[PDB]
């Protein structure tokens, strides 16, 4: 009897603990379902996720090994694929997510054999006793990388079941699979680690690894990355590192503070007079808002999949405090624009950009939209790359008043906040 290795959102062989702890008691075949509860969601992020397993497989096999890819829901599929197998048990990575719990529950009912799930890999686990809100209390709980696991040398041979559909993703997809992943890693550690600190604000987010697609996916491991920026070491090791810690600590918060999903961590924002208006929330949605630094971003993130992390704070504050647009449905709209899209973090994000408490910061943030593009982008290439309508970041024709606008949120928001 075989041992079935459950691979969700870890599509990968490297530093992964449920594949080893299986490989270790005896032969083992591995399994992805496809499951409607992630797939009914954009053409690019559908395709994405299916491409990755179709590199997992591709790695499977090039090792000599088998992956069952199955359609439907898990509780009703892990059960087959252990009926057809007659696996001993199932092995998994733990989910501490609200979705996680209630698959990874409802298939342990219908499971006749053992459901053994282990603790994903990361720098800081999202379960601790104490609950912070704060990143730098949170972040000094981390001492440094524990070393990764390896992958397997060669897998043992069995047989292989399901259909990998192919889907249109709309755009131009990254290099798909862990062994894509593991160059882009390197090149980002030997090319533009030394400089990361001075170089991770900029517009176009050329000077960052750009690996957040694989990430969301597990196709990299976060303790596979920070080790190895650990081994290169410098200044810009410590400061990329830390970044992989903001994306541990949004599972913290998400986790701690479940009813985030619903209103802003901040008590004294739940009662804010959000004005829902489609006709401006379209114009931000398609970058049509006459701000030369939100049209770009929302230009690039419609035609890319892809988003750095200056142009996603302005472009996702931008609707929260110039458009007053409601948080939810926008940030709902952004995830699925994002091939890395990823619930607790772009939570974290518009939580932290649209000034609703994430890590206390402060209403009294106001984004300059002209000023912000003239700080990061420094004679004008991205600009010209997603907007040349525009000939600078002023605003031409802007669907509000900056300033009126401006005046307006940080006059709402004193009343609310320190009032
Ligand atoms: C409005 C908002 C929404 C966002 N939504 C998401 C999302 O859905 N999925 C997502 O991956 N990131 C999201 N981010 C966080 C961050 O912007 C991106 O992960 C970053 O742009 C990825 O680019 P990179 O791979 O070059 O990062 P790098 O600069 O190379 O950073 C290394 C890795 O650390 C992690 N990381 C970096 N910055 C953050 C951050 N601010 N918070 C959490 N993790 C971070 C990422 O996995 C990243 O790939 C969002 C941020 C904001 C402001
Ligand atoms: C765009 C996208 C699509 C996904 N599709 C998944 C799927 O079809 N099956 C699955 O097991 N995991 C899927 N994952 C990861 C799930 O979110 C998973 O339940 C999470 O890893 C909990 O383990 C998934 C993630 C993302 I972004
Ligand atoms: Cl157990
Ligand atoms: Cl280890």
């Known amino acids: ?111 006749p054999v053992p459901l053994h799930l282990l603790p994903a890999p990361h720098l800081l686990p999202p379960d601790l006793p104490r609950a912070y809100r704060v990143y730098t209390p949170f972040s000094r709980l981390y001492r440094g990388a524990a070393p990764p696991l390896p992958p397997p040398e060669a897998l043992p041979k069995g047989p292989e079941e399901g259909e990998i559909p192919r889907e249109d993703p709309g755009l131009p997809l990254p290099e798909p699979g ?20 001075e170089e991770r604000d900029r517009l176009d987010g050329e000077g960052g690894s750009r690996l957040s697609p694989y990430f969301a996916l597990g196709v990299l491991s976060p303790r596979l990355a920070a080790w190895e920026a650990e081994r290169r070491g410098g200044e810009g090791a410590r400061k990329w590192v830390a970044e992989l810690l903001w994306r541990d600590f ?67 504050q931008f609707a929260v405090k110039h458009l007053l647009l409601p948080w939810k449905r926008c940030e709902e709209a952004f995830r699925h624009l994002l091939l890395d899209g990823d619930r607790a973090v772009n939570l974290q994000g518009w939580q932290w950009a649209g000034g609703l408490g994430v890590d206390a910061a402060p209403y009294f943030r106001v984004f300059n939209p002209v000023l912000q593009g003239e700080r990061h982008d420094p004679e ?40």
């Not at 892990?78 to 001993?88: H, S």
């Open 178 to 197: 862990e062994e894509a992943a593991l160059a882009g890693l390197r090149a980002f550690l030997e090319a533009k680690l030394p400089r990361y600190a």
């Open 1 to 111: 009897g075989p041992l079935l290795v459950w691979h969700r959102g870890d599509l990968r062989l490297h530093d992964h603990p449920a594949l080893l702890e299986a490989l270790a008691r005896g032969p083992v075949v591995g399994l992805v379902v496809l499951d409607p509860n992630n797939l009914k969601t954009t053409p690019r992020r559908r395709a994405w996720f299916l491409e990755n397993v179709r590199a997992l497989r591709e790695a499977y096999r090039a090792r000599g090994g088998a992956l069952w890819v199955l359609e439907g829901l898990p509780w009703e599929k892990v059960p087959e694929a252990a009926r057809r197998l007659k696996a001993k048990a199932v092995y998994a990575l733990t989910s501490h997510t609200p979705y996680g719990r209630y698959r990874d529950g409802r298939v342990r009912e219908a499971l």
């Open 250 to 316: 949004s599972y913290h918060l998400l986790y701690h503070f479940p009813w985030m999903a619903e209103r802003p961590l901040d008590p004294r924002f739940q009662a804010f007079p959000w004005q829902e208006d489609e006709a401006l929330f379209q114009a931000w949605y398609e970058g049509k808002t006459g701000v030369p630094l939100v049209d770009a971003a929302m230009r690039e993130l419609h035609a890319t999949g892809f988003l750095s992390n200056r142009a996603r704070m302005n472009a996702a």
């Open 380 to 419: 004008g290439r991205w600009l010209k790359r997603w907007a040349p309508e525009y000939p600078s970041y002023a605003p031409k024709d802007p669907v509000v008043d900056l300033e009126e606008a401006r005046r307006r949120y940080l006059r709402l928001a004193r009343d609310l906040a320190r009032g």
